[PDB]
Design an enzyme around this catalytic site. Structure first.
Site, short mmCIF file in Angstrom:
data_model
loop_
_atom_site.label_atom_id
_atom_site.label_comp_id
_atom_site.label_asym_id
_atom_site.label_seq_id
_atom_site.Cartn_x
_atom_site.Cartn_y
_atom_site.Cartn_z
N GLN A 161 100.44 13.50 25.72
CA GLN A 161 100.67 14.91 25.94
C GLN A 161 101.83 15.47 25.16
OE1 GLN A 161 101.65 16.32 29.72
NE2 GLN A 161 101.01 18.27 29.62
N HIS A 175 101.19 17.80 21.68
CA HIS A 175 101.38 19.21 21.74
C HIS A 175 102.25 19.76 20.77
CE1 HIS A 175 99.00 18.90 25.18
NE2 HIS A 175 99.52 20.01 25.98
N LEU A 218 88.40 17.27 21.87
CA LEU A 218 88.36 15.96 22.10
C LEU A 218 89.46 15.33 22.69
CD1 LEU A 218 89.84 13.61 20.18
CD2 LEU A 218 88.25 14.42 18.49
N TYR A 219 90.89 15.84 22.46
CA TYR A 219 92.09 15.34 22.94
C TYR A 219 92.43 15.89 24.30
CZ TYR A 219 95.49 12.03 20.75
OH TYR A 219 96.20 10.94 20.52
N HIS A 248 92.76 15.08 30.33
CA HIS A 248 92.99 15.10 31.68
C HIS A 248 92.60 14.20 32.53
CE1 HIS A 248 93.37 18.90 29.52
NE2 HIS A 248 94.64 19.09 30.23
N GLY A 270 87.97 10.81 16.98
CA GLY A 270 89.53 10.93 16.93
C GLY A 270 90.25 10.23 15.85
N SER A 285 93.28 11.46 13.39
CA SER A 285 94.69 11.16 13.81
C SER A 285 95.32 10.48 12.67
CB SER A 285 94.22 10.16 14.93
OG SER A 285 95.61 9.39 14.84
C1 HEM Z 1 100.58 17.38 34.65
C2 HEM Z 1 100.00 17.10 33.54
C3 HEM Z 1 99.22 18.15 32.70
C4 HEM Z 1 99.17 19.56 33.22
C5 HEM Z 1 99.52 20.25 34.45
C6 HEM Z 1 98.01 20.01 32.08
C7 HEM Z 1 97.67 21.33 32.17
C8 HEM Z 1 97.12 21.85 30.95
C9 HEM Z 1 96.82 23.35 30.81
C10 HEM Z 1 96.88 24.48 32.06
C11 HEM Z 1 96.17 23.60 29.77
C12 HEM Z 1 95.71 24.97 29.10
C13 HEM Z 1 97.12 25.34 28.20
C14 HEM Z 1 96.85 26.43 27.91
O1 HEM Z 1 95.70 26.94 27.28
O2 HEM Z 1 98.02 27.19 26.91
C15 HEM Z 1 96.25 22.56 28.91
C16 HEM Z 1 95.94 22.06 27.49
C17 HEM Z 1 95.92 20.84 26.85
N1 HEM Z 1 96.03 19.74 27.30
FE1 HEM Z 1 96.87 19.22 29.51
N2 HEM Z 1 97.85 19.02 31.14
C18 HEM Z 1 98.45 18.04 31.61
C19 HEM Z 1 98.45 16.82 30.73
C20 HEM Z 1 97.68 16.55 29.64
C21 HEM Z 1 97.58 15.21 29.13
C22 HEM Z 1 98.22 13.79 29.56
C23 HEM Z 1 97.16 15.21 28.03
C24 HEM Z 1 96.79 14.10 27.01
C25 HEM Z 1 96.27 14.11 25.70
C26 HEM Z 1 96.64 16.75 27.82
C27 HEM Z 1 96.14 17.26 26.65
C28 HEM Z 1 95.72 18.61 26.53
C29 HEM Z 1 95.49 19.26 25.29
C30 HEM Z 1 95.44 18.66 23.91
C31 HEM Z 1 95.54 20.81 25.53
C32 HEM Z 1 95.09 21.89 24.59
C33 HEM Z 1 96.56 22.43 23.87
C34 HEM Z 1 96.46 23.71 23.27
O3 HEM Z 1 95.51 23.83 22.64
O4 HEM Z 1 97.40 24.59 23.23
N3 HEM Z 1 97.10 17.42 28.87
N4 HEM Z 1 96.77 21.30 29.94
C1 LIG Z 2 90.67 7.50 20.61
C2 LIG Z 2 91.74 7.61 19.34
C3 LIG Z 2 91.59 6.69 18.45
C4 LIG Z 2 92.69 7.17 17.60
N1 LIG Z 2 92.97 6.68 16.32
C5 LIG Z 2 92.59 5.77 15.88
O1 LIG Z 2 91.36 4.82 16.24
C6 LIG Z 2 93.01 5.21 14.60
C7 LIG Z 2 93.96 6.01 14.08
O2 LIG Z 2 94.61 6.90 14.82
C8 LIG Z 2 95.01 5.37 12.97
C9 LIG Z 2 96.16 5.86 12.51
C10 LIG Z 2 96.90 5.22 11.21
C11 LIG Z 2 96.21 4.56 10.40
C12 LIG Z 2 95.00 3.95 10.90
C13 LIG Z 2 94.22 4.37 11.94
S1 LIG Z 2 92.66 4.43 12.61
O3 LIG Z 2 92.39 3.29 11.74
O4 LIG Z 2 92.02 5.50 11.90
N2 LIG Z 2 92.64 4.01 13.74
C14 LIG Z 2 93.02 2.66 14.72
N3 LIG Z 2 93.06 8.34 18.27
O5 LIG Z 2 92.51 8.45 19.24
#
Ligand code: HEM
Ligand SMILES: Cc1cc(NC(=O)C2=C(O)c3ccccc3S(=O)(=O)N2C)no1
Ligand code: HEM
Ligand SMILES: *[C@@H]1O[C@H](CO)[C@@H](O[C@@H]2O[C@H](CO)[C@@H](O)[C@H](O)[C@H]2NC(C)=O)[C@H](O)[C@H]1NC(C)=O
Ligand SMILES: *[C@@H]1O[C@H](CO)[C@@H](O[C@@H]2O[C@H](CO)[C@@H](O)[C@H](O)[C@H]2NC(C)=O)[C@H](O)[C@H]1NC(C)=O
Ligand SMILES: Cc1cc(NC(=O)C2=C(O)c3ccccc3S(=O)(=O)N2C)no1
Ligand SMILES: CCCCCCCCO[C@@H]1O[C@H](CO)[C@@H](O)[C@H](O)[C@H]1O
Ligand SMILES: CCCCCCCCO[C@@H]1O[C@H](CO)[C@@H](O)[C@H](O)[C@H]1O
Ligand SMILES: *[C@@H]1O[C@H](CO)[C@@H](O)[C@H](O)[C@H]1NC(C)=O
Ligand SMILES: *[C@@H]1O[C@H](CO)[C@@H](O)[C@H](O)[C@H]1NC(C)=O
Ligand SMILES: *[C@@H]1O[C@H](CO)[C@@H](O)[C@H](O)[C@H]1NC(C)=O
Ligand SMILES: *[C@@H]1O[C@H](CO)[C@@H](O)[C@H](O)[C@H]1NC(C)=O
Lengths: 552, 552
Positions: free
Chosen positions: A172, A176, A353-354, A357, A495, A499
């Site tokens: 997270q 972010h 994809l990330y 939750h 991903g 990444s």
């Molecule tokens: C207590 C923990 C968490 C809460 C309460 C939470 C809640 C939220 C909320 C409300 C949003 C929408 C925010 C917005 O639209 O501005 C969001 C977006 C998102 N969350 Fe979570 N989340 C949590 C944990 C996580 C975790 C562990 C990940 C792991 C990858 C994650 C990944 C994301 C991503 C990538 C977005 C979109 C960010 C963006 O585009 O601005 N979140 N989350």
């Molecule tokens: C799921 C997922 C996978 C992922 N990333 C990877 O699988 C992944 C990376 O992120 C990556 C990072 C630095 C050098 C090479 C690799 S990789 O070979 O493309 N590989 C291990 N991120 O989210």
């Protein structure tokens, strides 16, 4: 209406209309030709016959552990394989970037405007008869029904790979910095104009914010000491804008680079650790360079922390989630004689994809307490109460949820999951199978093949009718996991290349940056090259508590 | 006080202070080692003791015309050589970029902040005892004295290469899309955030300016017709901000992408031509694509004009100024199996070297009239009076001034020449000889060697005392020209790599862009690949007058 609505061009050929009811496929450099770029060139058939599938390669990387041990302990061989890993993984991403939410053809606007997330696949045109193009019904199935039937958690499903809360919150906190949707503008827009690992979540997106966060002595960031422990400064003291509900006491409104990090104590935990790490690196550099001023100490430390972040992400974080027995390596030098573009544009699909939750537990367990979501959110007092050491020890012990495999989105965040579905549709995402082809994966031919079971598949069949109409985001969460793995095939294969580009594309990985003098000399350089999640915690957290991304 | 003040590190090694009075050189990947990176590694010994000098290469490229004639007419050989030319010319530019006016060491601020010009050599540190580091006097010589003694025109010196006013105004028009100094902020800052050939000087830097210039029908730009001829629209019609003295009537306040292009009718001539070209290409694409809307016609035309511009810049413009008998080729494909970064950041020194004001004549000769500077400046009624055809015919015939060789800056722009000197100093430029070394050139050992004569050399020796303290900008204008050439060695050797990056670093040259569909099909693509300064004029100027960059 658009003759390209059906996505007729295959193998990354580009579709162009040539009249109201005709199209042309541009097969340039695809390796294929013909009306839809489906006839392979001879060399292409040779390539295709030889290349193993992603599941074959995943099997190899997750077995023969005794052999991977031999490899991991032979420096030149480990380097060689990592070099191959890098190049193999870096041909799928358009760099310089191409499409975005408003442009399904290449344009200067789509190239130049950094406020957009880029797109791996162009949007379905507005005048297409169905959401996915020409297949499926007039509207997609009710997002509430999809959410309720196959995404919402019944019983908590633990991750079989043993990911913990240190892992979940690192994911997270780290992501972010580059997933920062500009809700003013819309889901296809970002506020992270650095489009990658610039540590704006520590230092601030803008110069004005950064300067409000800086002490201007010794290169350091402002901090407060509370009960002998170092924490971020307050909003009140800094005028750094943060997002906090109105009931939060002034003395609890911690100010950090990323304005949403007051959301949960687990983000603030990581914010605090990296804050301490910056100032620690400042002390080291000052020791090495008593002649340096504040500005150079600050900038050099930031470069070092960017380095440490990329290092830890590859060698600990990605290492853990991959499940590979091969020991991934952070080594920019491996790309120096390869073709590779040192630049990155954050893709919308990568953001989508990330949304991991399902990682979250039903309650957050610290020491002997079990906090509900309502208790946990926006509650920095919990961090002060227990302290960083206890937070690390507790998060290291608490298992995270499985992401793929379906039905594991905690209900506390059901609105978030529904919004991921709705906003994907808003941004006119193409279907799961189109994305699969785009990343050289075989299209799923049924819903049972997607989930690997029968019950959720049946629900989805009733909802979508055609597997070709299945959407990317819900599919990622219901996909059949790899054996005892947290993710399915689509998640890893999409991903990984996004990444990689975000990490290796950083300018510090370029040959003119990747040298000791960039980082204040060999001492600073060594900080990057020896960094680990354990060392980050050991150096900055009282008592050097053991930590790890997996439960012990 | 800074121990790096003397620029101790050679061969692109990086200097870092290691205490108050010691420094360390980082010789990483220089091919040299030792305290100052001066001991060549063995393989470097090979490379060196057989690398031909720039003057030797220039000799070969500008003689043996009969041999080059054969070469130019064998496609694969011409391509092979151009491929070599491209790679031989792309190892000198830092890309991703490094230093800027405020940063003599790499920092995230210097990398990320697009408002700066970048720097090929870092600035001289503020606390250095002398302007150039440690050499010379406490102050550089009076800039007015330097200007008057060796820069200012006595008698007009014609360019022996035959460059004309079409050439001079093309240079000014083309470069002013990326040389756009932000005078609010200072000489080290730019308003050209695209950092290259984005055609903002036609379309506007920002979206809202672009939208004011657009017709929103058929992809076209707004225009007006005066006496049957197409011209840019007015400030009144568009609301776009232009720079005009308060006495210019409303009907003569032409609105174009670049706010300063009303400065001079020569710029307005090219602005008119390119506007006509855009609308011409819209017509062509609309014919190809009746099914396309205004937005796609606009964006596609812009991409096409970007390609046209690059094509013409390389094959006509740089072709003429180089004096090479080899026919340069615009072919992005030649870089596809090479290492090359598709990106660019505009260098301050590129900006500085491109102040080619000695090109300007004493008077501007249109038809039978000879206009003075006072008469010519901000006088678009001259363009309306004579028309584009007469402008092209007259400017094609009028010879421009020689740039190298000294004493050829017209008195009318003496303040501009003085500012180039004064702002170079402001921006803490290193010396001419440091710049020569930076670009693999032999340092001049005397002022007579620099000029190739005795009188100007003697004045400079009296002013500067030491050749190692000579400044870059006035050196470029007093330098001994190549035989009957417009430029000397330093101009060409610095200009060429910067220019190459700005052109080939453009995203349209990357493999994912360089395909027919990007430009609306083979028709759009052909417009780029057959573009020329002659056909640009032939298509858009009444009567299709002959034109060239040489008085011939
Ligand atoms: C207590 C923990 C968490 C809460 C309460 C939470 C809640 C939220 C909320 C409300 C949003 C929408 C925010 C917005 O639209 O501005 C969001 C977006 C998102 N969350 Fe979570 N989340 C949590 C944990 C996580 C975790 C562990 C990940 C792991 C990858 C994650 C990944 C994301 C991503 C990538 C977005 C979109 C960010 C963006 O585009 O601005 N979140 N989350
Ligand atoms: C799921 C997922 C996978 C992922 N990333 C990877 O699988 C992944 C990376 O992120 C990556 C990072 C630095 C050098 C090479 C690799 S990789 O070979 O493309 N590989 C291990 N991120 O989210
Ligand atoms: C009638 C013709 C011209 C006039 C009146 C003119 C005048 C000027 C002026 C007033 C400046 C601003 C100087 C300052 O702010 O200190 C300038 C800058 C400049 N000139 Fe010219 N000039 C002319 C032709 C040319 C030509 C033919 C070239 C050839 C390349 C050229 C190249 C440049 C460049 C590269 C700059 C810097 C622009 C920037 O950084 O924004 N100029 N000129
Ligand atoms: C790029 O760097 C410049 C130079 O520091 C920044 O301009 C300064 O910005 C502050 C506000 O943050 C002003 O108080 C100063 O007057 C500015 N200085 C100059 C010389 O203009 C600019 O903000 C930076 N741009 C970005 C996007 O960070
Ligand atoms: C990037 O694109 C967005 C979307 O078109 C631009 O946002 C528009 O800007 C205009 C100003 O010309 C406003 O009238 C609109 O309200 C904006 N739309 C949105 C959704 O914000 C943005 O200006 C572009 N950025 C740049 C630097 O050109
Ligand atoms: C003077 C000057 C020279 C100059 N440019 C050149 O000398 C120069 C170019 O600009 C360039 C443009 C595109 C591809 C290759 C070349 S080059 O090989 O580096 N060469 C001919 N720009 O100003
Ligand atoms: C066998 C010779 C092959 C062609 C070599 C031609 C080199 C002549 O080049 C000379 O280089 C000198 C360098 O400063 C310049 O002073 C001269 O102007 C130039 O003519
Ligand atoms: C516009 C040029 C200004 C001329 C007057 C001030 C220049 C004083 O400078 C002198 O000018 C002479 C001119 O050829 C040269 O012979 C001298 O070498 C130079 O010192
Ligand atoms: C090309 O694709 C279209 C699908 O839109 C199909 O109808 C046509 O028959 C295809 N032609 C081939 C595969 O040769
Ligand atoms: C915040 O956490 C504290 C423990 O530090 C707890 O006592 C309090 O009830 C929590 N606040 C809310 C609103 O739940
Ligand atoms: C290294 O460079 C410095 C120049 O300031 C000089 O003092 C020293 O002798 C040099 N050593 C060499 C060239 O071996
Ligand atoms: C403007 O140009 C006209 C020719 O069209 C010329 O006669 C007039 O003198 C010029 N104006 C000034 C102020 O020089």
């Amino acid at each position: 209406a658009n003759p390209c609505c059906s996505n007729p061009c295959q193998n990354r050929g580009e579709c162009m209309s040539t009249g109201f009811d005709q199209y042309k496929c541009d097969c340039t450099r695809t390796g294929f030709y013909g009306e839809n770029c489906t006839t392979p060139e001879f060399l292409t058939r040779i390539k295709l016959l030889l290349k193993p599938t992603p599941n074959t390669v995943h099997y190899i990387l997750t077995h023969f552990k005794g052999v991977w041990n031999i490899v991991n302990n032979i420096p030149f061989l480990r380097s060689l394989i990592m070099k191959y890993v890098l190049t193999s993984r870096s041909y799928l991403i358009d760099s310089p970037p191409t499409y975005n939410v408003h442009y399904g053809y290449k344009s200067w606007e789509a190239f130049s405007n950094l406020s957009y997330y880029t797109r791996a696949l162009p949007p379905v045109a507005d005048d297409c008869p169905t959401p996915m193009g020409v297949k499926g019904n007039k509207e997609l199935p009710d997002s509430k029904e999809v959410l309720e039937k196959v995404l919402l958690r019944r019983e908590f499903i633990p991750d079989p790979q043993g990911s913990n809360m240190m892992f979940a919150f690192f994911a997270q906190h780290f992501t972010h910095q580059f997933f920062k949707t500009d809700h003013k503008r819309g889901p296809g827009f970002t506020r992270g104009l650095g489009h990658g690992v610039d540590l704006n979540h520590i230092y601030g997106e803008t110069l004005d914010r950064q300067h409000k966060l800086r002490l201007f002595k010794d290169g350091k960031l402002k901090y407060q000491v509370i009960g002998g422990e170092v924490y971020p400064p307050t909003v009140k003291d800094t005028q750094v804008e943060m997002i906090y509900p109105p009931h939060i006491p002034e003395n609890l409104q911690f100010a950090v680079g990323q304005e949403v990090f007051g959301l949960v104590p687990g983000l603030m935990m990581y914010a605090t650790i990296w804050l301490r790490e910056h100032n620690r690196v400042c002390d080291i550099l000052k020791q090495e360079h008593p002649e340096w001023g504040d500005e150079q100490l600050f900038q050099t430390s930031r470069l070092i922390l960017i380095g440490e972040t990329i290092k830890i992400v590859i060698e600990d974080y990605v290492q853990h989630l991959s499940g590979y027995h091969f020991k991934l390596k952070f080594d920019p030098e491996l790309l120096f004689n390869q073709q590779f573009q040192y630049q990155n544009r954050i893709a919308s699909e990568f953001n989508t994809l990330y949304h991991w939750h399902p990682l979250l537990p039903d309650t957050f367990n610290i020491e002997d307490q079990e906090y509900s979501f309502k208790q946990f959110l926006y509650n920095n007092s919990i961090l002060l109460e227990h302290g960083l050491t206890q937070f690390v020890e507790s998060f290291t012990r608490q298992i995270a949820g499985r992401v793929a495999g379906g039905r594991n989105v905690p209900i506390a965040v059901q609105a978030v999951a529904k919004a991921s579905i709705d906003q994907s549709r808003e941004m006119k995402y193409q279907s799961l199978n189109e994305y699969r082809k785009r990343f050289s994966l075989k299209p799923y031919t049924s819903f049972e093949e997607l989930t690997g079971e029968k019950e959720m598949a049946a629900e989805l069949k009733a909802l979508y009718s055609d597997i070709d109409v299945m959407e990317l985001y819900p599919a990622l969460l219901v996909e059949k996991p790899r054996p005892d793995a947290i993710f399915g095939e689509t998640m890893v294969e999409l991903g990984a290349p996004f990444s990689l580009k975000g990490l290796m594309g950083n300018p510090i990985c370029s040959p003119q940056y990747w040298k000791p003098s960039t980082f204040g000399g060999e001492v600073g350089f060594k900080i990057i090259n020896t960094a680990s999640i354990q060392s980050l915690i050991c150096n900055n957290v009282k008592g050097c508590p053991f930590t790890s991304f997996n439960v012990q």
